[PDB]
Amino acid sequence: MVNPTVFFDIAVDGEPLGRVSFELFADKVPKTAENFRALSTGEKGFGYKGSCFHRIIPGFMCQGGDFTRHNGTGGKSIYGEKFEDENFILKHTGPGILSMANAGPNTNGSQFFICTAKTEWLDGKHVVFGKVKEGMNIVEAMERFGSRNGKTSKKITIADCGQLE
Numbered sequence: 001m002v003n004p005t006v007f008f009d010i011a012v013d014g015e016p017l018g019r020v021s022f023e024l025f026a027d028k029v030p031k032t033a034e035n036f037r038a039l040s041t042g043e044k045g046f047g048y049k050g051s052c053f054h055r056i057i058p059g060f061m062c063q064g065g066d067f068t069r070h071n072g073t074g075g076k077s078i079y080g081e082k083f084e085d086e087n088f089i090l091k092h093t094g095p096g097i098l099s100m101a102n103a104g105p106n107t108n109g110s111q112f113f114i115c116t117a118k119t120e121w122l123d124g125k126h127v128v129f130g131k132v133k134e135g136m137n138i139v140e141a142m143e144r145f146g147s148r149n150g151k152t153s154k155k156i157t158i159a160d161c162g163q164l165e
């Protein structure tokens with residue numbers, strides 16, 4: 001009934017930075033939200049702990065969740081290698097939106113991105129499934145390690161992650 005909350009404990013070259021928490025919109029996109037929740041707890045035997053934000057573009061997004069190839073070519077969902085676009089009810093309205101990365105229609109895996117700007121050209125193409133709850137300051141700090149081309153100047157990792165409540 002209550003949308004779940006998950007956290008990421010972020011590190012910068014192995015040094016702790018802070019916590020980002022997310023509300024997952026299970027009420028609107030249950031299949032998508034459940035995939036991110038399970039990858040955040042690791043309860044399927046795989047997920048986000050230890051992975052990297054491999055592409056960070058200030059004034060756009062921070063992207064991660066490639067736990068199999070570490071660079072934006074990999075990842076897998078709890079349902080199989082890929083799963084369908086569940087719906088496009090939610091839009092990319094501003095900083096803090098959490099949305100699925102993809103490589104075409106119906107190719108969702110594990111990769112996701114946190115918006116740091118409104119990205120409305122992504123509406124109807126990427127599935128929105130959550131938002132930052134606490135720690136947008138930590139996202140902003142992450143964002144400073146990115147670059148125009150997305151290569152980070154320090155390694156930004158999810159040192160720990162799981163479900164709150």
Ligand SMILES: Nc1cccnc1Cl
Nearest residue numbers: 073101102103109111
């Ligand atoms: N394989 C895949 C999945 C999600 C986003 N981008 C890619 Cl290339």
